[PDB]
Amino acid sequence: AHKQIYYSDKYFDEHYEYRHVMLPRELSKQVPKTHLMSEEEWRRLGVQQSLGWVHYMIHEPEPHILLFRRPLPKDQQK
Amino acid sequence: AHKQIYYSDKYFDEHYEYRHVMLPRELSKQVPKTHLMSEEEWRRLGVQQSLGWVHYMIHEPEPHILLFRRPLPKDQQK
Amino acid sequence: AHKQIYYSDKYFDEHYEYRHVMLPRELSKQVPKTHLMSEEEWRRLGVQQSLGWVHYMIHEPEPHILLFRRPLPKDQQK
Amino acid sequence: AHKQIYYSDKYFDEHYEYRHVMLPRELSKQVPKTHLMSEEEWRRLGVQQSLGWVHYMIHEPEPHILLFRRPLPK
Amino acid sequence: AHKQIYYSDKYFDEHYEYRHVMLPRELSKQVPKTHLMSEEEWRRLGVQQSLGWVHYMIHEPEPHILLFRRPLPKDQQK
Amino acid sequence: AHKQIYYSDKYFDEHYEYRHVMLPRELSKQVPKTHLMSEEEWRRLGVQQSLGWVHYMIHEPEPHILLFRRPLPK
């Protein structure tokens, strides 16, 4: 299944409205890491939005998590 | 600040105990993407755990999110 | 089951105290979608808080996720 | 139609492979509430993924959260 | 504030019904750390549910996160 | 001592740079509950990051969640 940029519903506070855009992993490799993007640059990624939206913050990168499990001692099991 | 592998507290169900290990981003580039790891391979990453823990599941990769905001219309503001 | 409101623990930064309130689905259907609520309106929903808490932001909407699973080929199972 | 469905990347454990699909709010209204979807049901919805994928679980419904703040004294 | 128990909405997979219950901190201090609870023990905590719900897993422990912020150099601000 | 502190990667908005620090459960007990930490306070705790970083917020306390399941009828 594939490469759809997803636009989430908007939410707002006392002064702004906000939204998240989800990129395919492939495309997020194109996002600059050292600076916020102009409209010119996020439009080159394929992001299409109406007037006046600003890339104001980099999202908190999520940790790379490894998952491990092991049998409990037998008398601890149910 | 730097490269500490983090071991979280354990939790359990009726049969197993579990834990998460957080890797520095650098090191997660070394984790295989096509298969689960033997103890030999996760020990080569620097993961140190006691006896019998098994890498049983790949964690759900988190979406790459872009954040945008724009001024509300003036009369919608507080 | 039941239908109580859950009040989280307070936390703070340099300027504000913060808390989340969790509504049961039937009451969350009476929350305005187009504006922030005043103290008279969120008290009418039944939020019991002391003086001065401000409804300042709409929580970002969570996606509606479908989960899919399928068996691995035998030779990829462990 | 024109609907943005987000397809997450796959992850797997010792026996299964898994994927999450993000639906727009409107198409969400059309998902059965009482039962899981058959392969013809999610293909009629517009989910375009390989055959064999099984709708196996209803996602955890996140609570409806109200956000409050109060200025500290100064 | 207050101190009610919040009961989430039920969801299901091919075999089970599932729900989360959220405890206020004072009551969550009386939850066993070393074993799963029986129906007599979680009812004694005040969880009111119908017959047959099983406490089957301990929720994974969340890290204790400190948040740090510092001003960007002027020439990196926007 | 020997304590695993996890340092998240940094992110920034238009005016600030941000970082999260993950503490082991035991060192967590030693964080002030009533006020934010000064730079000497978090340096005495073992947090080893550049000067200038300010402890600005107490993290959202996640609820204490009990997990229940019930078999469906068959």
Curated annotation (Swiss-Prot), chains A, B, C, E:
SUPFAM superfamilies given in the database record: Cell cycle regulatory proteins
Name of this chain's protein: Cyclin-dependent kinases regulatory subunit 2
Keyword Acetylation attached: yes
Organism of derivation: Homo sapiens (Human)
GN (gene name): CKS2
Lineage: Eukaryota, Metazoa, Chordata, Craniata, Vertebrata
GO biological process, one term: regulation of mitotic cell cycle
Modification N6-acetyllysine occurs at: 3
GO molecular function: chromatin binding; cyclin-dependent protein serine/threonine kinase activator activity; histone binding; protein kinase binding; ubiquitin binding
Family affiliation: Belongs to the CKS family.
Keywords, sorted A to Z: Acetylation, Cell cycle, Cell division
Chain's role: Binds to the catalytic subunit of the cyclin dependent kinases and is essential for their biological function.
Complex formation: Forms a homohexamer that can probably bind six kinase subunits.
